[PDB]
Every structure is written in structure tokens, then in C-alpha cells.
């Protein structure tokens, strides 16, 4: 009822998370763990009395999907200690071995909790010593993982010690546990739990050997304080320099140092994250180290139980909720001395894969569209065709699993078993060489436009998409032109820049064309139209520069509608492109695969079999992280091929890798199939079809 000022003392804070296989009990465990102490969500906090002193324990949301690298790894470096949860019936699984691997990767100290022991007693009918056998082999399994993947400084005192209470046993549904210290201190042994269980005398058991007591005791007695933890954690956590005065702001858990925090997850807008150094209050100033912008906070607050509560000044080593943070990502390093963030600069990316969806039941018609658009703005990478009845809607995102998650929102959560189309790869179109000049006549023959199109230099393209140069109509030509002139472009061309559009640009290099300024917006609409659908397979265009070299505009707007400016410039752009050797581009993925060494060849061979290439390779002892690039079109079904080849011990993710040119040998076939899917004639139009005659 007044516990808000434990946060002063860092060595009573416990930053922890629960690692578990699925159905193994983790949600239940957490619910009755923290209900047991009084009072997905981002973070939920509980205060617990251990040895007369009160501890503030942080239970942070931690996903467990092993086909998700990034989220899982992010949540687990957010925490300092972990409760590994294993079903006693099922045991240590390959997936358990994985989540343990990452847990232990970023120096997270572990404690084991065998759950579902009631199932052993009532349902599975074991002798006490069969239970001893089964407990001890789960323990031994885990301790050969700790043997195998722990840092050399830790692989024998980071083991789990049944005898010192680093291993609890119990039932999360029946709110009971047992460890040897709790026995030491209460005289409760297994015979009574078995007995009471068998009578069905749950309520006695509840309060003869209470879950949250035994478990949280194990937490405090064995999982480390933030200042306990950062002493070895922050160096491994990211490639900075410790000699910074900010280095031992983060090395210990210094509140009076510069503040430094990271966002763990986002939720009206509310960001939950961890404070590494310093102290936030509402309204100071914060530079978001690599999200382009910088900002400040409207409310600051902390967590009491499951409930969002508001306070002001919070020191380091705690978990905070903040609002007002516009474009912060999950994983956002927020601090104000500018340094480099704790994980890599993540490309913001465009959606690259699509599936078509149809409701089974006629009655789910009315506003599926805004459900799916709840998630379309929940996850910024998603786009869909809104409204009317098409068949209905295309869902476009970042990959197969990305989307199929959303499918199992279509019914784990909302009520519809669903039929989904095959997936299609969003391809794009571009050119390889510069064109001769091309003319665009309007139908009334009164307006003419002389253009060339040129392949865009990858430096400038990169510049546009990593944000250095901005999308949209140019709001400051003089400044933009310079930044184009920094990359190998002619300033006296760059100054006529007019528009940036989806990896292309439009430049006015005309001298004294009367009335051009009157059509220029229409010229841009036509430009955009020209880019929206390419001339090869009506796919979006990338890496093209359209330069207007000359023009003849009529003096009366009666001869200058959209009806005349659009087709003229649009087909000029397509004609030019067809003369500039137009090509297909496909999306790639960066694939990050983390495994035990024994499997590498298999992994490697798999990537080779998907037109993929190994890019990089990071090794830490017996754990191996392979980084590759492979085309999206070749990556379907990867979770299966890879689960098979690494026997479910691979932990992996993808990131957008940009787009690359499709080889000519496969290009044609792919173009014909795209056109065919689109209801078009397979054979791509050539320049003679697109350009007008004599």
C-alpha cells in the first residue's frame, strides 16, 4: 500500500523472466505466482518478503516462439535472471534446450522449476523414487546444457543445485511448491504433498507449501540484483567502451550518472522499458539514438501488480512505462549522450509477401477489415486492401510466419477458421542502363514531354530508403540537391529535383518552359502512376531516375487536364524503361540462424539449396550463429526444413535485406507467371508494344 520507495536500493530489485515450452505452465505459473503475493501484458511487478527484507521483483513478458529470434532474444536480455519451467510429465525438450541457450547467452543466471508434479502423483501414478529419478534426470539434462553453453567463468557455479534450493518442484495450478530450503524452514517434505494431493485436500496444500513463497525465495536467494548483474552483463550486452563515464553508469547501476534506458515493448500509446543508468522524469530531453527523430515524455510511471501506476523520478535498475514516444521501436536505445545503441540498426523495411483470405462463415462479413486494420497499425509493416468486396483482401507483410501468426489471430482469438491463398512474393521492376530520350505526347497533341530514365546508383537509393534522403515531394530542393551531390551526382542535375517516390525520383532539368509549373503536379501524379505498376508485369518500380529534359506546355488549362498530362508522361516513362533494358527485382532476407555446431553443415546445405549464400558467421564456444542471405521466393517452408535439419534446436529470424536483380534465366519464367496470376497475357510487352510508332 506504500512500497514505491524500494527502487532507491538496487540490490533488492530482481529483473527476471520465465522461460517455458508451451502448455508447460508459464502463463498459469505467472498468474498464480503474483496473485499469490497479493497484487499478454508488458510487465507485472510483485513485492515479496524474504528473510525479513522486502524485495521488488520484476516479472517481464517473455515470448518463447523459437521461430522468432529477435523478440525472444530482446526480452531475455531485458531480464537479469530466468526461471526455466519444465513440465515434469514431458521433461526437457529440444525447444527448452533452445530458450535456455538464449537465456544463458546474454549472461542471464538460471533457476529450474519443475512444474505439473500433481500430474505425476494423481494421473501418472508414480512411486516416490520414480519421481526422484525423473526429477534428477530433468535436473541433469539442464545441467549438461549449463555445462555446454555457459561462459567459461560460469559453467560449474551456474549449475542448478537441488540441495541449495536453486531447483523448486511443484504445481502451478494448485498453488504449491517445495524446495529444500522451504523444507529446512517448514519441515514440509514430499510425503505430505503427495498425501494431501491424493486426498484432494488442495486448500491445506495451498498454505502448507505455498507456490509464490517457495519460488520467489528461490528467485531472491539465487537470481541476481541489477547491480549484481550489470557488472558482467553490460560488457557482453553491446560493443561500447567501458572507460566512458557512462560506462560505469551502466557497469554498476548508477542513478546519478547520465540516464540510459531501452524499450522492451510497446502498447493510449505506452512504452515499457528498462532503465540502465540515471533517472527519468517527465519532460527532460531524449535523443532516440537511431530512430531519426528525438523527443520527450508526457507521462512517466511504474508497475504495481498488473496495474499501470503513475510516478515521476525513477532510478536505474528498474522497469518503467513512459508515453509520448512517437516512433520508438521494440529495442529502442533511449539516452542523451549520443552513443551507438545496444543492438544493430534495424531497417524499417517495406512489406514483401502477400496472401489472399476468405471467411468460411458468411456472418463474419461486417468489419473484419478494421480488426485486421487494428493489427495493420499495430504492426506498421502490414498493408491491406480496405473496403468493398474483392474476395476478400490481400494481407501483405514481412514473411510467411509473420502473416500466419496473424492467421492464428484469425482464430485463436476472434472466431474464424480460415482459408488462405498460397503466398505470393512482392516483386519489383527496374532498369539496367540509361535510355535514349523519349517523347510523351498528350492525346490532344498539345502538350509534349521529353524525358530520359536512368538506373539509380545504389548509394543514392540506399540514401533514400535508410532515410538520409526523404520520400515525398521535395520540400527543400536546395538542401536535398547537396545531399545528392555528395553521392556521385551532378549538382546541376540534382538541383532540379522535384519528387521522391518509393525508391525513385523525378527531376526537372528544363530551361524556360512556359506554363510547365501549371502541369508539374499532374506530371508528378503521372510519374507516381508510372511507378505504381511497371511495364513488365505491372509490379512496383524501384531505382529509377526520371529526368524531364524539355517540354512544350499549352497556354490554356482547357487543353491540359489530367486526361492529357497523365498518359503522356506515364507511357513516356514506360517506353523509356523498355528501352533501358528493364529487369525484375526480388526481395531478399537476412537469415540469422543460431545452432549447436553439430548441425552446421546441414544448415549450410539447406541455405545452398534455397539459392542462399552464407554471409557471416559468429561463434561463441559450442553455440554457432550463421548469417545468410536468401531470396524470399525460395524461403517458403523454411521452419520445417530447418527444424528437421537441426532437430528443433535452431533458433532463427529474418530481417529485410533489400531487393536484388532476378537472374535472366529465371526472370522470364517468373515474369510470365506473375502476369499469368494477374490475369494478363504471359508474354511481357516489349518496347515496340509500349512505345508509339513512327
Amino acid at each position: 500500500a506504500k512500497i514505491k520507495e524500494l527502487m532507491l536500493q538496487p540490490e533488492r530489485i530482481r529483473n527476471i523472466g520465465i522461460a517455458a515450452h508451451i502448455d508447460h505452465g508459464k502463463t498459469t505459473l505467472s498468474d498464480n505466482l503474483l496473485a499469490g503475493a497479493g497484487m499478454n501484458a508488458a510487465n507485472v511487478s510483485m513485492v515479496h518478503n524474504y528473510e525479513g527484507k522486502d524485495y521488488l521483483i520484476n516479472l517481464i513478458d517473455t515470448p518463447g516462439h523459437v521461430d522468432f529470434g529477435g523478440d525472444v532474444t530482446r526480452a531475455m536480455r531485458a531480464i537479469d535472471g530466468v526461471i526455466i519451467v519444465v513440465d515434469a510429465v514431458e521433461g526437457v525438450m529440444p525447444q527448452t534446450e533452445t530458450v535456455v541457450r538464449q537465456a544463458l547467452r546474454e549472461y542471464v543466471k538460471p533457476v529450474l522449476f519443475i512444474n505439473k508434479v500433481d500430474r505425476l502423483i494423481r494421473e501418472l501414478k508414480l512411486t516416490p523414487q520414480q519421481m526422484m529419478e525423473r526429477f534428477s534426470k530433468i535436473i541433469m539434462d539442464v545441467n549438461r546444457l549449463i555445462q555446454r553453453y555457459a561462459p567459461e567463468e560460469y559453467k560449474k557455479k551456474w549449475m542448478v543445485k537441488v540441495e541449495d534450493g536453486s531447483v523448486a518442484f511443484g504445481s502451478a495450478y494448485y498453488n504449491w511448491a517445495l524446495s529444500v530450503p522451504f523444507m529446512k524452514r517448514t519441515g514440509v517434505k514430499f510425503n505430505e504433498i503427495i498425501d494431501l494431493t491424493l486426498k484432494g485436500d488442495n486448500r491445506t496444500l495451498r498454505q502448507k507449501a505455498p507456490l509464490h513463497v517457495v519460488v520467489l525465495d528461490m528467485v531472491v536467494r539465487h537470481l541476481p540484483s541489477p547491480i549484481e548483474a550489470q557488472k558482467y552483463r553490460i560488457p557482453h550486452l553491446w560493443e561500447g567502451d567501458i572507460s566512458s563515464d557512462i560506462g560505469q553508469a551502466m557497469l554498476n547501476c548508477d542513478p546519478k550518472g547520465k540516464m540510459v534506458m531501452v524499450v522492451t515493448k510497446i502498447i493510449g500509446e505506452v512504452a515499457t522499458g528498462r532503465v540502465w543508468s540515471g533517472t527519468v522524469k517527465s519532460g527532460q530531453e531524449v535523443y532516440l539514438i537511431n530512430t531519426k527523430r528525438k523527443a520527450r515524455i508526457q507521462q512517466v510511471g511504474i508497475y504495481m501488480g498488473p496495474e499501470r501506476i503513475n510516478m515521476e523520478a525513477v532510478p536505474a535498475g528498474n522497469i518503467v512505462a513512459v508515453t509520448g514516444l512517437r516512433d520508438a521501436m521494440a529495442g529502442e536505445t533511449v539516452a542523451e549522450e549520443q552513443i551507438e545503441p545496444f543492438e544493430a540498426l534495424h531497417y524499417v523495411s517495406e512489406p514483401v509477401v502477400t496472401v489472399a483470405i476468405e471467411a468460411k462463415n458468411v456472418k463474419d462479413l461486417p468489419r473484419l477489415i478494421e480488426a485486421l486494420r487494428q493489427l495493420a497499425k499495430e504492426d506498421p509493416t502490414l498493408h491491406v486492401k480496405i473496403d468493398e468486396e474483392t474476395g476478400q483482401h490481400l494481407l501483405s507483410g514481412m514473411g510467411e510466419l509473420h502473416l500466419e501468426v496473424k492467421l492464428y489471430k484469425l482464430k485463436k482469438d476472434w472466431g474464424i477458421d480460415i482459408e488462405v491463398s498460397e503466398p505470393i512474393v512482392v516483386y519489383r521492376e527496374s532498369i539496367t542502363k540509361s535510355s535514349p530520350m523519349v517523347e510523351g505526347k498528350s492525346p490532344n497533341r498539345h502538350n509534349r514531354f521529353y524525358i530520359v530514365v536512368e538506373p539509380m546508383p545504389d548509394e543514392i537509393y540506399n540514401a533514400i530508403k535508410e532515410g538520409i534522403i526523404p520520400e515525398g515531394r521535395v520540400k527543400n530542393p536546395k538542401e536535398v540537391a547537396k545531399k545528392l551531390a555528395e553521392l556521385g551526382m551532378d549538382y546541376e542535375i540534382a538541383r532540379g529535383i522535384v519528387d521522391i517516390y518509393n525508391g525513385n525520383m523525378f527531376i526537372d532539368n528544363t530551361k524556360g518552359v512556359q506554363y510547365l509549373n501549371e502541369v508539374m503536379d499532374l506530371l508528378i501524379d503521372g510519374f507516381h502512376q508510372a511507378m505504381d505498376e511497371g511495364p513488365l508485369a505491372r509490379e512496383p518500380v524501384m531505382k529509377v531516375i526520371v529526368r524531364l529534359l524539355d517540354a512544350q506546355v499549352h497556354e490554356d488549362n482547357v487543353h491540359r487536364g489530367p486526361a492529357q498530362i497523365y498518359p503522356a508522361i506515364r507511357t513516356a516513362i514506360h517506353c523509356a524503361m523498355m528501352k533501358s533494358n528493364p529487369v525484375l527485382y526480388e526481395p531478399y532476407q537476412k537469415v540469422i540462424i543460431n545452432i549447436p555446431y553439430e548441425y552446421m553443415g546441414a544448415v549450410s546445405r539447406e541455405i545452398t539449396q534455397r539459392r542462399g549464400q552464407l554471409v557471416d558467421m559468429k561463434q561463441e564456444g559450442e553455440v554457432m550463429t550463421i548469417i545468410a542471405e536468401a531470396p524470399v521466393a525460395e524461403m517458403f517452408g523454411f521452419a520445417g526444413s530447418i527444424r528437421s535439419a537441426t532437430s528443433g534446436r535452431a533458433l532463427w529470424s529474418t530481417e529485410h535485406a533489400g531487393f536484388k536483380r532476378v537472374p535472366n534465366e529465371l526472370a522470364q519464367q517468373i515474369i510470365r507467371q506473375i502476369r499469368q496470376r494477374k490475369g494478363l497475357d504471359p508474354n511481357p510487352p516489349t518496347e515496340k508494344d509500349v512505345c508509339p510508332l513512327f
Binding site: 516416490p128 523414487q129 519421481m131 526422484m132 526429477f135 534428477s136 535436473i139 543445485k161 537441488v162 540441495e163 541449495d164 518442484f169 517445495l178 529444500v180 523444507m183 517434505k189 514430499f190 510425503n191
Partner: peptide
């Protein structure tokens, strides 16, 4: 793992 046996008795 000797502590484990203490829990049974």
C-alpha cells in the same frame, strides 16, 4: 542430488 533424497522422507 543428495538433497533431492532428503525431500523424500
Amino acid at each position: 542430488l543428495a538433497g533431492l533424497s532428503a525431500l523424500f522422507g
